[PDB]
């Protein structure tokens, strides 16, 4: 498995959330949501507040603390007055595995997906189940087998893992 090391500054997203009973329901309805927010015009809107911080527009995993699972379409945007009638998170600072998933979207996503999760549990100690794991779609076409979805997961202390030594 190939991955980059990124680390990210603290950022504010903008976007809408929803929540999802758990990680699987989430998967029977996160292609609906994004399915709403572009018929809506959400994702055209958005697409306009981006203020460039990250390029294209993320799809955020959420952990909740009674379990739940939440789903935040967003980008990168300043906190604002345009704002006001969407969803705001600070995604607090981190480094990263970095992914890509190539092929047409949503299936592509869904078993690269599959294989990170698979991979990254041989490091533990290293990833952060409470942080924030997220989609990112740059630009493009996503009914294309050449479009690449890049996959962000949250680590720490990854330089202390024996693999690294």
């Not at 007055?81 to 600072?93: E, G, M, N, Q, R």
């Amino acid at each position: 498995m190939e991955y980059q090391l990124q680390q990210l500054a603290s950022l504010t997203l903008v976007g809408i959330k929803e929540t999802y009973e758990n990680g699987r329901q989430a998967q029977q309805h996160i292609a609906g949501f994004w399915q709403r927010c572009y018929q809506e015009g959400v994702i055209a809107d958005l697409q306009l507040k981006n203020n460039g911080d990250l390029a294209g527009i993320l799809g955020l995993c959420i952990p909740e603390l009674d379990g739940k699972m939440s789903y935040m379409i967003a980008v990168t945007g300043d906190n604002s007055a345009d704002i006001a009638k969407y969803d705001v998170i600070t995604l607090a600072s981190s480094k990263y595995m970095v992914f890509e998933a190539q092929g047409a979207v949503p299936k592509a996503v869904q078993q690269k997906m599959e294989e990170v999760h698979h991979y990254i549990h041989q490091y533990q100690a290293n990833t952060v189940k409470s942080a924030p794991f997220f989609e990112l779609y740059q630009d493009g076409d996503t009914t294309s087998e050449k479009y690449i979805t890049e996959i962000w997961m949250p680590v720490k202390g990854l330089e202390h893992h024996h693999h690294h030594h």
